[PDB]
Curated annotation (Swiss-Prot), chains A, F, G, H, I:
GO CC annotation terms, alphabetical: cytoplasm; proteasome core complex, alpha-subunit complex
Molecular function GO labels: endopeptidase activity; threonine-type endopeptidase activity
Presence of keyword Nucleotide-binding: no
Pfam families: Proteasome (PF00227), Proteasome_A_N (PF10584)
Family designation: Belongs to the peptidase T1A family.
Record-given protein name: Proteasome subunit alpha
Subunit organization: The 20S proteasome core is composed of 14 alpha and 14 beta subunits that assemble into four stacked heptameric rings, resulting in a barrel-shaped structure. The two inner rings, each composed of seven catalytic beta subunits, are sandwiched by two outer rings, each composed of seven alpha subunits. The catalytic chamber with the active sites is on the inside of the barrel. Has a gated structure, the ends of the cylinder being occluded by the N-termini of the alpha-subunits. Is capped at one or both ends by the proteasome regulatory ATPase, PAN.
InterPro entries: Ntn_hydrolases_N (IPR029055), Proteasome_alpha (IPR050115), Proteasome_alpha-type (IPR023332), Proteasome_asu_arc (IPR019982), Proteasome_asu_N (IPR000426), Proteasome_sua/b (IPR001353)
Gene3D superfamilies named among the record's database cross-references: Glutamine Phosphoribosylpyrophosphate, subunit 1, domain 1
Protein task: Component of the proteasome core, a large protease complex with broad specificity involved in protein degradation. The T.acidophilum proteasome is able to cleave oligopeptides after Tyr, Leu, Phe, and to a lesser extent after Glu and Arg. Thus, displays chymotrypsin-like activity and low level of caspase-like and trypsin-like activities.
């Protein structure tokens, strides 16, 4: 009915095509991000499809530069095209202005690219949500972006399948300005609260930055110390 | 107040009532159907090895009356519990819109096969439809037995009739209605397992047919 | 627990039950149908070369009773095994969606011809539909024989009637119901082979109607 | 093994069986239908020039019994051979897909008119459908003759009735059922030639409904 | 050889047979229908000016028997010739494709109104459909006359009945079946002229439903 | 029927697709604007989805420049694309003419952008209404703009879900040339008259401008003084 | 339904058109690739349609240069257009940068070409999967790419009809850093484990490279030594 | 269903539109080609529609230059457009490179032209198959190309209606390196084995080349010597 | 079905839209052309719709230059656009090459224009057939061209309604190298053999050329001499 084209509003004024692209997000792995004292971190679960897969390869935390990073959920091909568009857009802003002063406009350029395909006929939306995390001259920023293009800046969030559960746990347990170790411990407990018990958390990815430093990926052993 | 009335309806028949009905169907009801089928098979084995005279038209066999009455009570319990599931689903059909009808289509798809369980399988109506009665016997098996038996008993007793094929038709009515109990219990087992499967797969949309946040609207 | 209930259902009637039914149909059932057809042909050859008087209205021929009872037991076994296949398919109809309905359409296409085997061919209902009864004779052939025979025997015995065409109608009822057994066994052979073919071609989608990895989702 | 079972089915009823049936229909069957039509025309010419009294209600004319029994044997042979063609087609309906249904539509289009030959033309069912019986007479012509004749013979013999229109209705039943044999043989000739044409044009897709190399796939 | 069989069929019933049938319908058949209508009008004028007593229930009027028998022979000739046209068309329905169905749709459109001529107008079936019998009287008018007349003659003769409206119903049955002959001849004239028009406009596509050179293919 | 394409009139000459886009506006939060003595103000409710959301982030009052401001309702991704288009258009007019003399043509350029997509096939309309408020060389201006593109200049209005209620209360209570404190008090009472009682108004956003001054966002405490 | 256009999401957020294009991959011949000690190899089955076909012609292992190679499965016309696009893209990177330093972006350019046609209306996807194998300055790389555009780097994989078998055998039997003869023997045993027994493996193609060397096709006799 | 557009895959990943364009090929006249000792030949049947047709006109063997030739089957208008595109492409390669060194890329350019219309919406495929035969610097080449764009190089083949029969006879009877007279005799016997007996072969076209020579059409009498 | 778009093949690989355009040709007036001794002629019937029509106006024989001429049948508006495209194409070849050496490529350019519209979506075919007749440096040429674009060179042909009849009579009666008077007499007898008797042939158009001469329209009296 009002259903099979991106350019058709419903009689209540909804785009069901966009919300179906939002339903595409819920099939991905759970990732979270949170602000802490002078910094911000990202944590991400992974589907380990088999034992023949490379571990040290396609990773759910992706760097956008040395001062913006991002995680994705949804269609992985769309998500990779998005992360590469974000990298090219960040480098264009660096050529134009010498530096990236606000992460928010990098998020805005990615989100306007996503909004542009919820409007013109002959394209489909992007079935991906993203979380951006980094340091800019305002401070630590943390965003999400969705198939509609809606931008939200948070203290903490998740995306993916277990998103609600993780959000609910943070809806009881998150405090500002934690030290980095306590913040990661809270994040790992949050990610465990989204699993269905019996099923146990294999080694996730964690990235973090503090103000005045560069990027920092936890290797697997440092992650094992919190499991 | 209107929302108070809707809340009183939906608190009257929650999901736990229908799921308790599904627990009763998976545990006890199928065993009861199998037991009725075994009683029908034993009675049909008794009838198959018998030769009837006039004296069998002078009394009604109480074994067949017990089997048919047992099957009638079974179909009564199945119809009432199916109506309980039907009411639990039907009091949650949302506001009628020309959109967002995934869960509404799930609800109509489950109500259609509950209608097939009630109408086409239990035969719980006055008259069968133009599609006929695809059930071998209905809700009112025992009245059909007593009526079709009483016509032949009237023809045999009366001077009574001298047709031997009438006397064999007496035995054949007895055997055929036990056979109808066998076939109807088998088809009722199939329909009950189909309803159990559809409910246990679709109950999340049966209870909440329309979810969804206005994320985009602020 | 809900998945425990679904698992108990699907472990009750696995694929091996239906495939054992298909093995029974390919091996023994078609030979049994052919044997019933040959018995019907021999009985019809006996009836064709006979001239009846009053004395043939005084007894029922037990050969025809044996043929009809044999065909009735055949149709009972075929209906119960067809219901076994129907239950094996029907307890695997997945979550109702408005998509991904290739295997679901396969399941409905197989259940439609199993319905055609049960309803339209075995005639296992109370009343036939508005499409009629395209089977020549039904599940309850022997009761139809005894009833239509008993009416004519009542008209012949009573002073009995003097119409010779009534006496020829007696012979014609005997010959016609053996003819119905011949035609019904032929059509039942055709329907059984059609069901065997459809199952052995489509069972992979009958058991697993929705497969598919979320390769693209991570 | 499953492919062994499918191979046993398809080696049981090859294409040569159905084509031998088509050879029998083109050569002998149409001549047999024309001969039955000429016998019906001669019998109707005998009946047309006759005036009946009470004595014609005392015996059944064996000429009409011979014509009707001959037509009954004809319709039996036609139904069994049509079921042979139907089985040859029906055991080659391929895997049910939502595509590549050109040959499958050919097979359903041929099975539909074979159904029209069996159901609507031969009248080989218990009850006719809601569309009626468009055939003038059915598979069981001779029982209809003997029943409708025996009612009028009972009314004429009994003191017998004094209505002269009853006596003329006796003659009219005789003439009308020979007329039904004429019309039914004509329509059966038309249906048989239609089936022969459709088979001889479409048998290449009836046997192989899905061909085609994966040229593009390597 | 298959093409030999198709050639024998299509050389059996060429286009000239159907066109000779159309020549017979345009020339003689419509005049015969008008003559039967005038005989029916004269007989109805005889019946309208008559007052009946008991003695008219003692004999059947042979004028009405002649009119009804004449109309019966007319409908027999019309049905057989319509079946000749139907066979000429039906043995040229080509290979079933999902394309190129202009001439095939022409053939089905002509066969549909020939079916309407046979079924709905001549009433040449056992039972009428769920749409009813829109013809005023059928193929078997004279049996309907003799049956509905014989019931009333049995009620009048028996002490006979004393209802005067029964005696007037006797006269009314006579007048009404002549009236049915009038209305049925009028509607049959309309249907015959419609069939003549459709054949003479569409016979080029009826005979050759698919022409066309592969000009583009070499 | 006449229903599933933007380029199709009804037999009464209506575009149901446009009015369906107008139904998207009614699911947004209520905002209002009103003129007062030498000035104009905007007030806006907010959905506070959770306690994990940032307060000091994406805000319903957006500045278009130091003399034009705007509130939105409807599809939030479309609304952000619209506010950014309005900002770029205002800066283009400032390049061309040195100043913004009439707010009305900024509104007209935004509304022509919105009207252009109620006409051409393969695009959908913008499911957003906007209220513009500011000072120009004519005086205090106050507008709304809708998915059709229709522009109206008002004394006072609302957009959003409670719009009708907030209009009707102003249809009893609005007076010209109020002092600023009285005007904000009237606006808060108007916003409270749209709620369903029991439900209480959490801290809304209020902006205001007077002639000869730039903008002035109330902080949360200055808002609390009126609750 | 949600079914016959590339630009339409399902209500679960799936593109059935893309997964149908993924079903085209399963009709091709089985090929595999695996890493070994300082090197990487490719093995591929072939349909030998008739005896009139040329053997020494269109081959399932195709060179992309002297330091990237590839195998395909699916629609062969699309696959040949893809291999030629990969060759042109590799030569463009060599013009721009003097050398190919990472195979991953050659794979990324091919995969972005494949992703671009899962989005825009009026084109169909590419019904082909590819495996890329080679040496770059990181080491031996081994990839697959699919009709969606999803890139994965592996130790070992298959594509084609027997893929699920060949993966599963490798899911029991693969070890890192095998010598080359042992790795090829493992691959031939893997390819034999996908056949339906009775049916026997005719002469397959095998390519391989070690670090510091160029490309090396086995001729047929060197293949016969392992059958 | 999956049936009436070039841009729609089936659920099994097939393009029925392309395979229908392949069904268009089977209505043309049978032509064959085969390699022999240092050379290659083409043979082609013809529909002789009437006696009023010109014999010495539109011919089924067409020259692409003095060192590539071709036969076609299918839609004749598409086939003529294809042969003219092949001629223009050959002359472009001769302008660019001075000579045609491999016929295979002339075939590849024609086949990429044919593949391009199995992908974009609004065009139909070309309903023609082609056989190319000639000498290049590799040796005698012999190809076919089909509506999908699939290229195959052969020892011998047919296209057209009797293709299968002509393949099967060659599947019993073809030997390499025959002298030219024996190769043509084998080809004429192959073409006769596709007719339905009673029907007899009227005068077909035959072309051939040996290495180091140019092109050579048999006139009709030299053809009559083999009938 | 496979029926209402130019870009859709049938399951047998036919374009019904093209053959429907070929059915438009059969509603036009019959025209014929034939070669004779050192020359070629065209003859054409005309519908004379009323007596108010101008005779000496729009004529079925049209000159393309002084050394190519043409007749048309089908949709007359399409036919006039075609004849004007043929005239412009002939003059372009004369600008480029100084002369027209082969009529066949003028026919090829017209036929490629006609073929181009049997392929792209959004255009219909040209519902016209044409016959070209003239002298070039090869000799007398005579062609027809159809809505598919198929070109054929003939000794003699017709187009139009009575085409088949006019072909069949020529299929009995045509001989090469007749003198011009005998050739025109044969053509008039051919055109009379397509009428339904009782209906008589009013004054047709006849053009003719011999080698080394220019164009020559018979006036009406010279045509009357053969009626």
């Amino acid at each position: 009915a009002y259903d099979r084209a991106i350019t058709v509003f419903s009689p209540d004024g909804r785009l069901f095509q966009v919300e179906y692209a939002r339903e595409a997000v819920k099939k991905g792995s759970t990732a979270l991000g949170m602000k802490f004292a002078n910094g911000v971190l990202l944590i991400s679960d992974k589907k380990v499809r088999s034992r023949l897969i490379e571990q040290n390869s396609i990773e759910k935390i992706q760097l956008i530069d040395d001062y913006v990073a991002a995680v994705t959920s949804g269609l992985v091909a769309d998500a990779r095209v998005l992360v590469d568009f974000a990298r090219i857009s960040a480098q264009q802003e660096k050529v134009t202005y010498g530096s990236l002063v606000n992460i928010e406009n990098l998020v805005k350029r990615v989100a306007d690219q996503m909004q542009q395909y919820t409007q013109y006929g002959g394209v489909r939306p992007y079935g991906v949500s993203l979380i951006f995390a980094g340091i800019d001259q305002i401070g630590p920023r943390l965003f999400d972006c969705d198939p509609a293009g809606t931008i939200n800046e948070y203290k903490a969030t998740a995306i993916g399948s277990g998103k609600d559960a993780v959000v609910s746990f943070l809806e009881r347990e998150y405090k500002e300005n934690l030290p980095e170790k306590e913040a990661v411990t809270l994040g790992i407990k949050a990610l465990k609260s989204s699993l269905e018990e019996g099923e146990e958390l294999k080694a996730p990815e964690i990235a973090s930055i503090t103000v005045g430093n560069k990027y920092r990926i936890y290797d697997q052993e440092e992650v094992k110390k919190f499991l | 107040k209107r929302a108070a009335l809707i809340q009183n309806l939906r608190d009257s028949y929650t999901e736990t009532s229908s799921f308790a009905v599904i627990e009763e169907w998976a545990a006890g009801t199928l065993q009861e159907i199998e037991g009725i089928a075994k009683a029908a098979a034993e009675a049909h084995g008794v009838i198959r090895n018998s030769t009837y005279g006039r004296a069998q038209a002078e009394k009604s066999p109480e074994q067949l009356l017990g089997v048919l009455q047992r099957y009638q009570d079974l179909c009564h319990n199945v119809y009432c519990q199916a109506e309980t599931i039907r009411t639990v689903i039907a009091i949650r059909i949302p506001e009628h819109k020309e959109e967002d009808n995934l869960g509404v289509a799930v609800q109509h798809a489950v109500l259609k096969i509950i209608d097939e369980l009630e109408i086409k399988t239990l035969g719980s109506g006055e008259k069968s439809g133009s599609g006929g009665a695809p059930t071998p016997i209905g809700m009112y098996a025992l009245r059909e037995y007593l009526s079709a038996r009483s016509t032949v008993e009237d023809k045999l007793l009366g001077g009574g009739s001298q047709s031997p094929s009438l006397l064999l038709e007496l035995r054949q009515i007895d055997a055929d209605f036990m056979l109808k109990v066998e076939l109807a219990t088998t088809h009722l087992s199939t329909m009950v397992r189909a309803v159990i499967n559809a409910y246990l797969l679709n109950w999340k949309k049966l209870i909440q047919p329309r979810t969804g946040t206005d994320h985009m609207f602020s």
